[PDB]
Design a protein around this ligand. Sequence first.
Ligand code: ATP
Ligand code: MG
Ligand code: MG
Ligand code: MG
Lengths: 132, 357, 80, 52, 49, 208, 101
Amino acid sequence: KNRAARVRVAKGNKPVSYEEAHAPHYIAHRKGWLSLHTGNLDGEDHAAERTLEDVFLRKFMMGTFPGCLADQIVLKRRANQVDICALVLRQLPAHKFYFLVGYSETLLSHFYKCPVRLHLQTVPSKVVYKYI
Amino acid sequence: AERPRTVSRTSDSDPAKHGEQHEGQHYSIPLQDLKTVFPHGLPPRYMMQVKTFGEACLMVRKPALELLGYLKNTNFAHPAVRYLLYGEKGTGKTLSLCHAVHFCARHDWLILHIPDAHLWVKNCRELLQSTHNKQRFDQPLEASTWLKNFKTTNERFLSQIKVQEKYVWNKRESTEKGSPLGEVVEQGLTRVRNATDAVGVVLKELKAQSALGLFHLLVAVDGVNALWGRTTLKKEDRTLIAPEELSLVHNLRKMVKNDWHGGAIVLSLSQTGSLFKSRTAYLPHELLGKEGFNALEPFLPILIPNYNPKEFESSFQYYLENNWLQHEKASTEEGRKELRFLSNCNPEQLERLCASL
Amino acid sequence: TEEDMDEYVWAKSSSENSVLQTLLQMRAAESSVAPSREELLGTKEVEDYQKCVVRLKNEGENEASLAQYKESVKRLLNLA
Amino acid sequence: SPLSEYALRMSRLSARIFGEVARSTDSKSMKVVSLFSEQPLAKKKETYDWYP
Amino acid sequence: YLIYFPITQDREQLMFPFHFLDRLERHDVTCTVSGGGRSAQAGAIRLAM
Amino acid sequence: SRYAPEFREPLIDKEYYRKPVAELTEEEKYDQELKKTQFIKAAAATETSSVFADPVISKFTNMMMKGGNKVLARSLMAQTLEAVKRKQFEKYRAASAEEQATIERNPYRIFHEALKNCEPVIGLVPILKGGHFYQVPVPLADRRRRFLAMKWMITECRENKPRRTLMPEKLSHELLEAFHNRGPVIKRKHNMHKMAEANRALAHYRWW
Amino acid sequence: YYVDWRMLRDLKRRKMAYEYADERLRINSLRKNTILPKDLQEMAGDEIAALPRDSCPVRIRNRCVMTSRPRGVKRRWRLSRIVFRHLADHGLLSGVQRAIW
Ligand SMILES: Nc1ncnc2c1ncn2[C@@H]1O[C@H](COP(=O)(O)OP(=O)(O)OP(=O)(O)O)[C@@H](O)[C@H]1O
Ligand SMILES: [Mg+2]
Ligand SMILES: [Mg+2]
Ligand SMILES: [Mg+2]
């Protein structure tokens, strides 16, 4: 049996998001890609360096916004600009988000030497695609 | 119908009688002329047709009529003219050249017919060195086989013609000046070591004596493109040899030159058996090359085409006349139309397709 | 050398020698006194033969171009 | 086929123009040109910066 | 077609369309086949014709 | 298969399509109208309207082919037919007028009648009675009877021949010696019949 | 901290090969020819041998950057098959999908 990235069935009480519900074979069919860069296109270089930055950028955002992430973040690279689009729960006060945005942007712009912007869409609570 | 069956045979056994009226008609070659004029040089598959049918019959065709016309009007005083029969595979170049060899043979010419010249540049199992020139090599078996056939064809003229010089075969054996040319041939067959040298003496003597008006000389070389090409023979150092190095090839290259008179040279190109040439190469420059083309010019190219509508019907009726096409549907119009498409009127392909049927 | 040249030049080539040698043998058989080289290679017969050889060497070799060469040889060699 | 004088002297004139090796060089000695025309494996950013 | 297709079975495959309609020797075809082997190229021409 | 089960095997008989409509039996007439609304499989590369195409020989060729070498197997069959035609022409020419009449020079007619002679009618088969297998004489079907004749020919020639002989020379000499019912392959047929004779006692065990 | 002591040894091999790249190029060039005296070539054969062993660039092994796995790595991403599949099967690699055909 295949165990890869499959949220298995319980007794109908496990909420799962759209991203979690779909197994790997639905990638490019029902669900898209969380990161969009040009490094895996044919005749393009620096796939390894873009992929390592993604791993870190995801671990950074989880720790910097602990318990405030409704879904996995979406990374969008255009030219040298990096754009982070994160669904965040409305747990923290509003002013705290302004602090963490200023901090996380400046810190990641001086770490990778690129302009990095954070885009936050706040949800009242996690969106449930289906109960499995 | 059998209307072309009337056109599928002619009673003019003698090649001189043939003319445009006889086109597309098969003339039977006399049995004695097969065992004398043609002990060699006939294609291998045609020889199978002569054995099974019990008779050799050569279709009269416009290419071979044009050539016979030039041979009749030959100006022996003028230098020898090289006639080059070039055509695609299976078109009949060899048998068009065999038609010319029959015409000259019946007029009492001296036939110097090399049946295939590719056999002298490949698959040689005995390659010695030459005493005359140590650079050159001698092919004993290849020369011995040709001489035995040359003897059969020209047995009559081997007593009249006589050597003009003394040839020392060995310390204990030499040919006195004045002795018949048959003696040179006899020694070559008797002592295989000298066989490649007897040939050179024969070619040299005939070329010199022909100009004296004693006899006419037809130098008929089929597969001439081998002389100025490449070889697949290797020296003791495992290095490929070149055509000039070989003794038989070097002697022949002189005979195909127009520096003598008293005869005519009839050449043919054959990509079949050729070394290092494409399957779809038939034109004179492609097969001869730059060396071969320059060597032979000015030459007269005679294109051998595929069977025309008249000739294809004559060949189709000839097979039907001998009961060869035993399939029930072959005699029908749908069979004939099918055989025309698959063969494409190519003489060789038509013979191959009909062979199975 | 001749091999190096990309465009055939009939002048001072193997063809010119072979043609000139044949025409020298042809006039000798006629019993004429030995002729000049320029005389033999100035005739129209030799002019056309030059054009045909050059076409085969430069323009390309084909059955059509070979037919043209066949006629020039017949005129040059006085063949019927 | 062999290279005549014209062919060989033209080849040297070309190599002199295009900055190619002009002399007759063995296959072994043509590695010196390769070694000094190609970035070595240890100097490529993929090798020395393989790890984060 | 005799030169391009030295194999009889490939030529027979080109004969099938015309022989079926008894139209042999009544049309002139110009083909341009790229790709595949000898047998796959004869079949592609048969359908095209 | 890449053909859906709704596809129909092609009919490549030239005369059939050109026959007058009235000459066709209504059953045959019905299928034609039905086929206008059906799908038709493409014809195989060896399927043609040629008048010289014989299915029996085409099948015999495929049973000689090794590793998809159709050119070689077809070439060997062509050489065989020629080797048989050339062997009968020699005999015909070297025979009296009376003998000449009997001699058959058609290779296709020597091939078909040679195979039919080798065909075995009844061959032993394993049949289950009382949860036990017995070798009971059975009537061989048409397809199995035809297959066995061809297989026995291609196997005598492939194996039981000298090293320097060639298949067109062994196969020709075997088709001709099975056209007169005096060959090794006929002896193999006589063994299958001889063995069934010994086991006739168990004939009634057959339930069909 | 790197993944393990094996990745640490590999990292040092990569930084000592970069230091000795020009040197090992210049010396090794003197040996890869037939134009210089064999006495010089025999001596250059020892100058290259005398350099430290970790300067040799054939002692570098490509390891997964995240797990330090010596085999199973894909050179375009520098990840093992196990790590690559985890990122690919989660939609985190841009343009990588399963191959159905
Ligand atoms: N004049 C002819 N009379 C009878 N049969 C002929 C004639 N010309 C050609 N053929 C047929 O064509 C076959 C091939 O002829 P031949 O070998 O002379 O052709 P070719 O052009 O010299 O062939 P290749 O290019 O293979 O040397 C013959 O075996 C014969 O069946
Ligand atoms: Mg020939
Ligand atoms: Mg550890
Ligand atoms: Mg290694």
